[PDB]
Design a protein around this nucleic acid. Structure first.
Ligand SMILES: [Ca+2]
Length: 615
DNA sequence: TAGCCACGCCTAGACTCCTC
DNA sequence: GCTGAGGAGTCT
DNA sequence: AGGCGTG
């Protein structure tokens, strides 16, 4: 008796966002009516709207619409939607380019024929450039082309962009808490649900926690609209870059740079600046800064390094937005000054201020440190003593390396075809470790989530849980996660350190039994093949190791989540384990990886780098 | 005879968009 | 240069 | 678009 998957999900999105009065303040009466109009539709009207909401925004020939699960004849349904203001008809189709677009290339030929002034052959794009040229000069003949084009195209529908824009903004608000937020969304088509959410949201069961909110994110409807707009801008700039369209990207960035300067002094920014970091990420400012970051990337790719440096300096000169990015910025400033602008004095000042910055961390911190020693210990630099300046000797302990071979066929090897990691897994099986998981950071991260679940979903921290569909407290990736739960963390971390390998087995099984399936960002239910396999692994790893790992992930998940080895292997009977990073022929350790290995060693654990050489 | 042309049919491969 | 896989309809 | 037959 249920709705189809896509309608359930879409329904869960609206429900979630509607139950917040905070959030509905950011919609006017007109806009809210659109939501009611939607609920007012029939099950069929609702189904059809969502289908088309999920598809690209443009005209669709009536003969290209078919959803048998909806209705064998869609016209009463289209009618309902056109009545309610959601859909529109070939009647409202008025722009020429649009009608030309909706026509098949054959149909564009026929229309090229029954119009004498046209050269009947050429690509679909060609004919269109032509027909549009024609109508721009001799306008009245253009109206005739339009008329016949339309009649040729037949009956058509298109989603109405006004009601659609409302749902985008509803989807956006749903997604600061869930969707887009868990690594920002591509959001093509104008703002649909992600495939994953569309398919699963309706079925997802979330962890239980208590919604408690005390602070507004957006000033008013206008604020939310400015944000939305920055979001769309950023997404486009990203997409440009993803497609190697750097000149386009540049222009957009520049344009976005101006807008953000036009918004300076605006009263809303006063309140934004005053939000806690875990909220401040949801402000126009944050998003523009994020844009300004892509801008340096863009400049750098166009080898415009002087400019890149200027932007980097701007970025670094403020502490309001994206403090987590400073490590990357500093590192990047340094690299540019050193390698491209070849300017060794500032390179040193840069490195020093960088290292003096409590915001730079793990990977980038190390990368800046290494740059300092490479420099201070160099001839063409020796003409100074400004890098002897009390640099903490932050060395990283070396780790046992090893090598194996595998016949080479993402590099695929033949053993059956397999990855570099699978090849190592094989080696470690013949080396006596009957068990193994290739899970990089998710193995540790799901252990951490299993062991600290109840702390992670703890009550008592205002603003971290704003609605029903979160898979994590909003501060999880903030310095504040730890600090806002200091007593409880220190407790549990300690209890883990001291725990016997049966305490661990039991704790894990507690969470597993009460939460299995519940959606939480740290935990992958399928990561371990069973609860027993999770139990075996915590027995081998033991209290002191697990405790150290959890401390890192809870102190600074943001800068620690990356770098954990590819592999965890263990011998069933000896209980001896090994944490292994697999490196194929052409890759070395990243800074994050070396920091993690040293740290795992310190916690007393067998860590190995395993290089595969190919035949 | 080889070698050049003219003409139209048919489809592989790419591409877009959609689906779960 | 990737972060989903596969199918259908289209274009040329 | 471009391979292919056909005449
Ligand atoms: Ca690896």
């Amino acid at each position: 008796t249920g709705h189809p998957y896509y309608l359930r999900s879409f329904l869960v999105v609206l429900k979630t966002v509607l139950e917040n009065e905070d959030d509905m303040l950011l919609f006017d009466e007109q806009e809210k009516g659109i939501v009611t109009k939607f609920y007012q539709l029939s099950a069929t009207g609702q189904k059809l709207y969502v289908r088309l909401f999920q598809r690209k925004l443009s005209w669709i020939k009536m003969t290209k619409l078919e959803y048998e699960e909806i209705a064998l004849d869609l016209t009463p349904v289209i009618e309902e939607l056109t009545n309610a203001g959601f859909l529109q008809t070939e009647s409202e189709l008025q722009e020429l380019s649009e009608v030309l677009e909706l026509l098949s290339a054959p149909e564009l030929k026929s229309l090229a024929k029954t119009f004498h002034l046209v050269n009947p052959n050429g690509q679909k794009q060609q004919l269109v450039d032509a027909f549009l040229k024609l109508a721009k000069q001799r306008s009245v003949i253009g109206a005739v082309i339009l008329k016949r084009a339309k009649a040729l195209a037949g009956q058509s529908v298109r989603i109405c962009k006004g009601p659609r824009a409302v749902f985008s903004r509803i989807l956006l608000l749903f997604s600061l808490t869930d969707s887009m937020e868990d690594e920002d969304a591509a959001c093509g088509g104008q703002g649909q649900l992600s495939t994953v959410l569309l398919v699963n949201l309706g079925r997802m069961e979330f962890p239980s926690y208590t919604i408690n909110r005390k602070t507004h994110i957006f000033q008013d409807r206008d604020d939310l609209i400015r944000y939305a707009a920055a979001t769309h801008m950023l997404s486009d700039i990203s997409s440009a870059m993803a497609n190697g369209n750097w000149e386009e990207a540049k222009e957009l960035a520049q344009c976005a740079k101006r807008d953000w300067n036009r918004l300076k002094n605006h009263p809303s920014l006063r309140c934004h600046e005053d939000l806690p970091l875990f909220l401040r990420c949801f402000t126009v400012g944050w998003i523009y800064t994020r844009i300004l970051s892509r801008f340096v990337e863009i400049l750098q790719r166009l080898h415009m390094y002087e400019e890149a440096v200027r932007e980097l300096e701007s970025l670094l000169s403020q502490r309001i937005y994206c403090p987590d990015s400073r490590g990357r910025w500093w590192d990047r400033l340094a690299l540019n000054l050193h390698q491209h602008l070849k300017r060794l004095e500032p390179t040193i000042k840069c490195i020093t201020e960088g290292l003096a910055d409590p915001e730079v961390r793990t990977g980038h911190r190390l990368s800046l440190y290494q740059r300092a020693v490479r420099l201070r210990e160099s001839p063409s630099c020796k003409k100074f003593k400004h890098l002897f300046q009390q640099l903490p000797e932050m060395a990283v302990q070396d780790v046992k390396h090893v090598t194996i071979t595998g016949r080479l066929c993402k590099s695929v090897f033949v053993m059956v075809l397999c990855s570099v990691e699978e090849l190592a897994l094989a080696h470690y099986r013949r080396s006596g470790f009957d068990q193994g998981i290739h899970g990089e950071g998710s193995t540790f991260s799901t252990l951490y989530g299993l062991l600290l679940w109840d702390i992670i979903f703890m009550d008592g921290i205002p603003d971290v849980f704003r609605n029903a569909c979160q898979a994590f407290p909003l501060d999880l990736c903030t310095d504040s996660f730890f600090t806002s739960r200091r007593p409880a963390l220190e407790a549990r971390l300690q209890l883990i350190h001291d725990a016997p390998e049966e305490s661990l087995r039991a704790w894990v099984a507690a969470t597993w039994h009460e939460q299995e399936g519940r959606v939480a960002s740290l935990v992958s239910w399928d990561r371990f093949t069973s609860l027993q396999q999770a139990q075996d692994l915590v027995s081998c790893l033991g209290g002191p190791v697990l405790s150290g790992v959890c401390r890192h992930l809870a102190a600074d998940f943001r800068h620690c989540r990356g770098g954990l080895p590819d592999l965890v292997v263990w011998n069933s009977q000896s209980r001896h384990f090994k944490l292994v990073e697999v490196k194929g022929p052409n890759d070395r350790l990243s800074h994050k990886q070396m920091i993690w290995l040293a740290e795992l060693q310190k916690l007393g654990a067998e860590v190995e780098v395993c290089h595969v050489v190919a035949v």
